Paper text:
Because computational secondary structure prediction assigned the N- and C-terminal regions as mostly disordered regions, we selected the central helical region for crystallography. We found that the R260A/R261A/R262A triple mutation reduced the degradation and obtained diffraction-quality crystals. This construct of SH3BP5 (41–266; R260A/R261A/R262A) is hereafter referred to as SH3BP5-RA. In addition, the M167A mutation was introduced to improve the solubility of the selenomethionine (SeMet)-labeled SH3BP5-RA (SeMet SH3BP5-RA/M167A), which was used for phase determination by the single-wavelength anomalous diffraction method. Finally, we determined the crystal structures of SeMet SH3BP5-RA/M167A in two different crystal forms (I41 and P41) and native SH3BP5-RA at 3.35, 3.6, and 3.8 Å resolutions, respectively. The asymmetric units of the I41 and P41 crystals contain one and two SH3BP5 molecules, respectively. Therefore, we obtained five different apo-SH3BP5 structures in total (i.e., one from I41 SeMet SH3BP5-RA/M167A, two from P41 SeMet SH3BP5-RA/M167A, and two from P41 native SH3BP5-RA). Although these five apo-SH3BP5 structures exhibit a similar V-shaped conformation, the superposition of these five apo-SH3BP5 structures using α1 as the reference shows some flexibility of the conformation. The hinge region of the V shape contains staggered hydrophobic interactions so as to maintain the V shape.
Residue numbers in the entry: 41 to 261
Write the structure that this text describes.
Amino acid sequence: VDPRIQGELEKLNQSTDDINRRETELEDARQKFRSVLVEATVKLDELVKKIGKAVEDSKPYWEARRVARQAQLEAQKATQDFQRATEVLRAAKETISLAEQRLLEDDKRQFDSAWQEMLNHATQRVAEAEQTKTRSELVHKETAARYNAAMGRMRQLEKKLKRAINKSKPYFELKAKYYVQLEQLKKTVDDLQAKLTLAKGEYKMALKNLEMISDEIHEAA
């Protein structure tokens, strides 16, 4: 059946012509990635060759800053986890203290069937609430120490290398501007090719639809 195959032919023909774009749109994005990559390294080398001692001397400071960025997130999460651990023990103390007066000696005996049901639930949680609160608190002592200790090294190094630091700041930022640009080009290249794989994939599926259709026509009469 001449129409049966021509329906897959043009379905295959449109898919393979789309690939010719994708192969260029990838190669173009790939080459531009190469071009920015090589310019990034040569403009940064000239900046090192001028005055590059400041760069190596600044590395102990920037590492001491890298350590600090970590310790401050650790301290913040320990801060927020301690803020939660206090709020549970409080709600457990408020629940118990409020329920204590009503039930003790049963001077009031109102909803006395229901009050303990909340008090005993509270009684059980306090055992764990006090465990976990002391836990997060002690960890908060560790992290807040590590935090304000990592700052002390960075600050003292800032005093000890402030000259080298102020000269390497333009170097790191032109490196960062180029990085994020390269990061931008790296992202565009990576998904543009996977887009082609799904394009090539849908092309190869046509060659099987034809391998079967021609086989379906053949097994007729």
